[PDB]
Ligand binder design. Structure first.
Ligand SMILES: O=c1ccn([C@@H]2O[C@H](COP(=O)(O)OP(=O)(O)O[C@H]3O[C@H](CO)[C@@H](O)[C@H](O)[C@H]3O)[C@@H](O)[C@H]2O)c(=O)[nH]1
Length: 429
């Protein structure tokens, strides 16, 4: 009888984490309204089992639609990078529809993502409580806000220093770091992380923002066998811990030079590999001519989409060459796979540092101009996977996995307390 409306940001990684949060709330007697674009909602429904039909209802948010920008492109999954500004515009232009949904559904609480400032303001206008859920890590956020208060000192608890390539919209984001708060809705933030990895940063961020930081993560989905049948057949023929999974996400498409370096790095390592290579939604050559040679049956290149979670939980997988996106990093730590980091942009360089700090993987360093190196990638794959001579990395990965697996339902105890208090304060309002 208490209804929460969840509004994620467009984009599969954000969408999945909200769904895992939705499932937890549903099991706690909370009626959920899951709101997003139709393309995103369909992509995420298979992961929602039938048992939640009664308690989790899907709500469609309508973005402005045109014949060359139809609703299937109203997402960041496979979107051409040129079209992303249009997507940001279209999302903002949907605020008025959000009001109609919000007023008509009368949710007691709104949980929103960290990329739609119009969503809390719309909720405030209609006397609806709103709480921020941040699907990504705390390390990046704290590092960003540290210079504003202490431009003098270095980052207090980390020995990581950013590389020159990434040192180098942001305008609107440095206006979110001064966001005023004069109500309980903004007294707390939900974060997709856990203290064993970012406990010190969570304490620091709480001081920086003067707000409660409540961890509710990690939110990993433990897995139709759509593509797995062929992949599992191939994977079972390989020796244990002999194969690497290579993925760079759904919102970034590596360059021609970048993929050549990684392909050659894979070949030199002599490892087995499953590589998901993707092309934008709009539209052999991309990989080096003749690459798939020594890597005949020692490698697979999947087109479009692959079962990342299932592959990583196989016992033949001993490594994950990743772009160090937050959800992929959490999955690798949950499943006990050491990460071979190849960060590309956004928060990924910081997340790669966090993996290195935690001892659960190694980051392949970029050259002075910011260019991927074949030799660096090959060395780490050989050391981590082909010749298991970096055994400290491997042990910490399973130890981290063991820690993550052992967490029980107490993971959400703090969140339910904060929402309950907030939901009482608004009865008075
Ligand atoms: O072949 C694939 C590729 C991805 N996934 C899943 O899709 C998600 C991808 O995670 P991640 O790569 O972290 O998310 P993306 O949306 O692809 O990338 C973003 O991940 C961050 C957190 O969502 C964002 O803030 C950044 O803009 C961007 O790096 C995870 O659930 C993966 O398991 C699969 O199941 N199969």
């Amino acid at each position: 009888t208490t209804t929460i409306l969840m509004l994620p940001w467009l984009g599969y990684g954000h969408l999945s984490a909200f769904l895992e949060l939705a499932k937890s709330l549903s099991r706690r007697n909370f009626h959920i309204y899951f709101c997003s674009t139709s393309v995103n909602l369909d992509a995420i429904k298979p992961k929602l089992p039938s048992s939640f039909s009664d308690s989790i209802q899907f709500v469609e948010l309508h973005l402005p639609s045109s014949p060359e920008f139809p609703p299937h492109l109203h997402t960041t999954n496979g979107l051409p990078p040129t079209l992303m500004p249009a997507l940001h515009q279209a999302f903002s232009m949907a605020a008025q529809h959000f009001e109609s949904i919000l007023q008509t559904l009368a949710p007691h609480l709104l949980i929103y993502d960290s990329l739609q400032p119009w969503a809390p303001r719309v909720a405030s206008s209609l006397k609806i409580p709103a709480i921020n859920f941040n699907t990504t890590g705390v390390f990046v956020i704290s590092q960003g806000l540290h210079p504003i208060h202490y431009p003098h000192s270095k980052f207090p608890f980390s020995e990581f220093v950013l590389h020159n390539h990434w040192k180098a919209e942001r305008t609107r984001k440095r206006g979110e770091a001064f966001l005023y708060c004069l109500h309980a809705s903004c007294s707390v933030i939900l974060i997709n992380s856990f203290r064993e990895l970012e406990g010190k940063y969570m304490d620091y961020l709480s001081v920086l923002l003067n707000k409660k930081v409540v961890p509710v993560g990690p939110l990993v989905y433990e897995p139709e066998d759509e593509g797995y049948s062929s992949i599992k057949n191939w994977l079972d023929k390989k020796e244990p811990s002999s194969t690497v999974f290579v993925s760079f996400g759904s919102e970034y498409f590596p360059s021609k030079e970048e993929m050549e370096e990684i392909a050659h790095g894979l070949e030199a390592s002599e490892v087995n590999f499953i590589w998901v290579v993707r092309f934008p939604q709009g539209d052999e050559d991309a990989l080096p001519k003749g690459f798939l040679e020594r890597a005949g049956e020692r490698g697979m290149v999947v087109k479009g989409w692959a079962p990342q979670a299932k592959i990583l939980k196989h016992w033949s997988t001993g490594g994950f060459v990743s772009h160090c996106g937050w959800n992929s990093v959490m999955e690798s730590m949950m499943f006990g796979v050491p990460i071979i980091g190849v960060p590309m942009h956004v928060d990924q360089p910081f997340n790669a540092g966090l993996v290195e700090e935690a001892g659960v993987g190694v980051e392949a360093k970029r050259d002075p101009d910011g260019k991927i190196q074949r030799d660096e990638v090959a060395k780490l794959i050989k050391e981590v996977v082909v010749e298991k001579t970096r055994e400290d990395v491997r042990k910490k990965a399973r130890e981290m996995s063991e820690i993550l697996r052992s967490k029980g339902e107490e993971k959400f105890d703090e969140m339910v307390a904060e929402i309950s208090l907030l939901l009482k304060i608004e009865h008075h309002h």
